[PDB]
Amino acid sequence: PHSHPALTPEQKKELSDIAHRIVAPGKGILAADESTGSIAKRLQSIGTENTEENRRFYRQLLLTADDRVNPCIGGVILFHETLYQKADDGRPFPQVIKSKGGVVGIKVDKGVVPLAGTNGETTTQGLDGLSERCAQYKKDGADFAKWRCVLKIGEHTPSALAIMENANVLARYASICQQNGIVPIVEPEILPDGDHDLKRCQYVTEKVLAAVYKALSDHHIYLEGTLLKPNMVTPGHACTQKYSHEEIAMATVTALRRTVPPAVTGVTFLSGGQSEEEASINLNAINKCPLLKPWALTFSYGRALQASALKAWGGKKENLKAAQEEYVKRALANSLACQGKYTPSNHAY
Amino acid sequence: PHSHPALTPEQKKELSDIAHRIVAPGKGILAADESTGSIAKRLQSIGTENTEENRRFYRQLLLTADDRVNPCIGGVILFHETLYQKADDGRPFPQVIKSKGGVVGIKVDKGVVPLAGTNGETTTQGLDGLSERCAQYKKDGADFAKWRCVLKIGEHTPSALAIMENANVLARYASICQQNGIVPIVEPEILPDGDHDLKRCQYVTEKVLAAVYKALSDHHIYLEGTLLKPNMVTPGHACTQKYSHEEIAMATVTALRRTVPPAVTGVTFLSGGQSEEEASINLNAINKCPLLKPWALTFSYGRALQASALKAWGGKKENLKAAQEEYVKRALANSLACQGKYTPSNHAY
Amino acid sequence: PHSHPALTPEQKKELSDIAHRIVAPGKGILAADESTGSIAKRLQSIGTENTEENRRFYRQLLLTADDRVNPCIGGVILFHETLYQKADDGRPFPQVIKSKGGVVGIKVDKGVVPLAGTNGETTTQGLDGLSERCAQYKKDGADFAKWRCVLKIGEHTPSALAIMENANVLARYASICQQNGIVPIVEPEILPDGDHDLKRCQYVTEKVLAAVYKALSDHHIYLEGTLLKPNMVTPGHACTQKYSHEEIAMATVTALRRTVPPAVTGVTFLSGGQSEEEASINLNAINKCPLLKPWALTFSYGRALQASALKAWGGKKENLKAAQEEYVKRALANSLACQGKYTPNHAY
Amino acid sequence: PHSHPALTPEQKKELSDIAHRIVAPGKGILAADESTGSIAKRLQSIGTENTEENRRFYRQLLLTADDRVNPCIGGVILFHETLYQKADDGRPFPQVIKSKGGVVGIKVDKGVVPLAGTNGETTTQGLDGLSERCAQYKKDGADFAKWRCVLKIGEHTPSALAIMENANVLARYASICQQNGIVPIVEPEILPDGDHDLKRCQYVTEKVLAAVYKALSDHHIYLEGTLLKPNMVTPGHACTQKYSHEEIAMATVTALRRTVPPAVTGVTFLSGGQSEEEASINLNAINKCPLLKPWALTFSYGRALQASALKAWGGKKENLKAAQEEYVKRALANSLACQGKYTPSGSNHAY
Ligand SMILES: O=P(O)(O)Oc1ccc2cc(C(P(=O)(O)O)P(=O)(O)O)ccc2c1
Ligand SMILES: O=P(O)(O)Oc1ccc2cc(C(P(=O)(O)O)P(=O)(O)O)ccc2c1
Ligand SMILES: O=P(O)(O)Oc1ccc2cc(C(P(=O)(O)O)P(=O)(O)O)ccc2c1
């Protein structure tokens, strides 16, 4: 094969430097990039009207929490609307984030679409005009991006088509980001839905991540200028067999060691529906796993950072500080967890 | 693998019936889907201002040419703008086309974009929201679509990445079309640029089309409900070796026989920069090639149907009939050519 | 990609000419390449000892049937042992075959082996030293070869690995054959075992054959110098739903039309465990199917040509003529069937 | 996809334990598996007749070198013939190797064959009957195997076909070995021939290794029970641009970090035509490279361990001790090199 380099040394340095800042020791990501339809559910859960101002205020509440979160938060993923909103003091939210030591991220996918001829499987759209969007987002303060693909474990899923196509579109997204100075977070989420056990999740995760990294290679992606946002390896939500956090950690770290090249700068786990505590305990067990882990293992959490804060807020401005305190408590917990410092046989894998 | 049928028998019948109508014996396609920027080059060549009204009048001139074209024209590919324009008598252009026995087609890609890490290679964008666009276009009178991928022959091209990715995006586009009752024309154009010879073009065409049909299989595409729009197999533009039309025909038909399943309903060749006469003579020779050809071999021509008509028009309303006459003459010529009736060893392939 | 031609025009002409001779109109293939272990079961079924001489005599019985078979038999696939055996008159069996207008073929695979990490799936071995073996078989009178891959329909099979790997090894085998003047018959057999229905067999057959032809493209195989030996598309053995021969034919031809490039010179169906009559009726229906079929559709039959002959023989020399007559009858039947002359769609 | 496990936990433990023993800190591999035709060239260069006894004597000279080599040699790759030969005292050579702390390996490929339709590219044969051969070799004392694929950098090579096919056959070989308790060393050698530069070798090495590990995944290979034997990343032999050992090290380690999952137990470099000292200096620089390296980085050397010993021997029995001393000296040097402790005394964004 013949090299026509995708990136200059200067471009590589920029991307690697950004990626490393996001996942520096003790740091993880606040995933605050819920679309309006997704944040509508959460505001509904606290009897709060889904208005642009309430969304602004709620995002403000998280982003302006006090300086205790600064060493915990290496990056914040925003939804488009929020990237262009301002705090009460008039500061653009990206400036707020940066002033606290955080890197600003932007979700750029345009959601899932059905794959015809599959058993309810999807790919993800959003490539059209993405290069121009990335150039604009970079000018407007974002240095990394997020794109979510979704796979499901079932009798006939994930299919060969779903694995190949989601890996391929992730690679296209990553390529476009890197041409524009944006670090792509590659998110091939395997949902926990179903009654499958831990070893089945581990098996599917291994196959998916092998496909992801082959596609990234085929598309000439610079891995040092990327992050990976995978599911932890867990039993299915409905699995009747029970597992310890140490078993979840061993399956997760084993799957990653078998598939993720050491050049990848970091792994920022999604927590899906895990409780706030569950997500911290699992991340902590992952970091205590006694296998060699050549990448940062940290968090990219939404509900696992926000659930208690949202409830404490309750849509009432006078609950601001109480709500922020709940978020700080989870930021501190997960900052400890991504160092193996949180307290509330590998051949079998 | 497990079947979760992409299409019902009723959906398949609709797509197969449309595809067969377009390429019925003696019929081919007027490719009139030049974007505003693309048609600008045309109108500039005749000192005509690139306004919507001038574009409307020119498209009208072609679409309302007299009834002699009806048995020649099985389909017309339109650009979005034109699908929603009307002739002077108030008739929507899709109604004009249908009243003359033509199927209405719509170009749906959003142009090429660069593949990072390649020697100037591209893929094509346009999948975002494509399902909704197809449903709307179907409602508004279109029954087939076009999507153009572009590959180039050079020292290191087409690369494995470019072949793989362009084949994959063609398959996604085809899948989405078929879910919405739209027959996709799959266009993997290999440009004739360069100094390569006929056998190099044949080799690359064979490899590209094998990749295209494997991707269509992987994505569960119903081939009977598709058409193929390939390059003919020709020497490169800068090649100094001379070849006969019979050699071009043999290389073209051999390449297609080696790659295109008989289930594909028809092949509608692009002619690129070929002269009007060259494109007709080549197509005629292709149809006279003594090898077995289990698909229709016809035309999807732009300049090869329009060049003399555009010149005779000159932007002047009073040249209407003179311009229409030149177009009619080429429609008649190519209708004969796609039957092997136009007049102005295989182991070596 | 860059062309470094696998084959010269002269090499291509040789392979295309051989391939076309084998499947010329009215002609099919006698598949007589059973391993000794497979033919043992057969000789036992007629109380005949599985000796070298009894195998020789049985193969002689088929190969020296009278000249009525000549327009029926375009090729005969032999097992190694038989390629080097002689008829009673001293003629090598390849000379016997050629003297009757047949092309001689040689089975070259060395059987299936298990794919670790699968649910009982296999690939096929036999590439080692294959080039030198082909060169020798060519000198010894063979002009085509056969290699059998085996796939199974089940809840999780055929797996992506099994499809990928069997397609790849077929392509390697085909490539080596073509370098040595041998036409490869590519046999990706999907077993009929199981209770799946006709559309499931059609779906799997379509996916397998697409993978096969992509692998053949990747390995620079000259399709005009090949033949395909697939399963017909049928319900599984244990399927309770019943289908007509016209439905089997439509599914089979549709699957082939969706995957087999017109450049492939011919399709020579295996019949497996189908009765002699069933195999003829199905092949006839395939050829009467009213879709366009740009390749020869004929037979590569073993038991469907041999079953009644084996019975009439019974291991007894005095039944030679009676046994040969049964074989001739099936050769004639299948010669008619591969022309659509034998008498005893959007839903696809 | 559905798991029908290729290996039990016990089988995995056996393979992982073997793999780790071979590449334990300070240890590398003596690659002594030259076929009869290949060793003929070596013996002629010292005017010695290529007889079975001379081959036995030469292999004995290496395998019975004194105990200084024991902490240096974690594994020895043998050719079939040698696996069944005995030392002068009657001990089978596998017992000799084991008694000195080494794991016994067996080369199981049957050589390269040409890929039709390529510019002189090859794949490698040897799968036929390989399972039975592996079971027999395991019984007869071998615990790991070697299989060599060869790729070339040129105008149109390595081609997509060559990359795909060599990766696939390596995966088949690895699968069969692991079913029989044999650790497969996966060797996708990219030859150094040609005038390409360092960044071109790095690029091709990255693409080849990504294909290798995708194939191993597709074939359900247990990476912890494997080793990798790649080329170092170097300029081509005819390249006119000069590079430092630190640049070679950086390019090599970067390429591996970008493709080799951390689960792989170790990387045992081939040295090709590098001189004895060059192969040690480069391996040492690789181990001093200031990037994170989550696998052992050690040697699987033939000529780089044998060249001076072969010369000092000269086919003369009376030169035995002198010849063994030269081998010991290279074993000691490379044991230091694979720890980054070798001395002659005894920007990464640019990649
Ligand atoms: O609304 P969409 O446009 O589809 O975008 C999404 C989709 C899923 C998300 C999940 C999270 C968290 P969760 O709160 O734990 O679910 P996770 O850590 O990434 O899983 C956060 C933000 C998300 C945004
Ligand atoms: O402007 P774009 O949006 O990119 O869309 C295009 C691009 C190329 C085209 C080529 C043709 C003819 P040609 O006039 O002979 O070149 P062909 O037969 O398809 O080659 C016709 C219409 C085209 C429209
Ligand atoms: O013993 P092996 O070495 O594995 O080789 C084989 C395997 C299957 C065979 C099947 C047939 C006939 P069948 O008698 O109808 O089954 P088919 O027409 O090819 O199916 C003929 C010869 C065969 C030889």
Ligand SMILES: O=P(O)(O)Oc1ccc2cc(C(P(=O)(O)O)P(=O)(O)O)ccc2c1
């Ligand atoms: O003769 P074959 O059957 O083909 O088997 C081979 C081929 C190449 C070899 C190279 C080496 C050394 P080298 O002596 O340095 O070349 P490397 O370190 O593995 O390169 C050692 C043993 C070899 C054996």
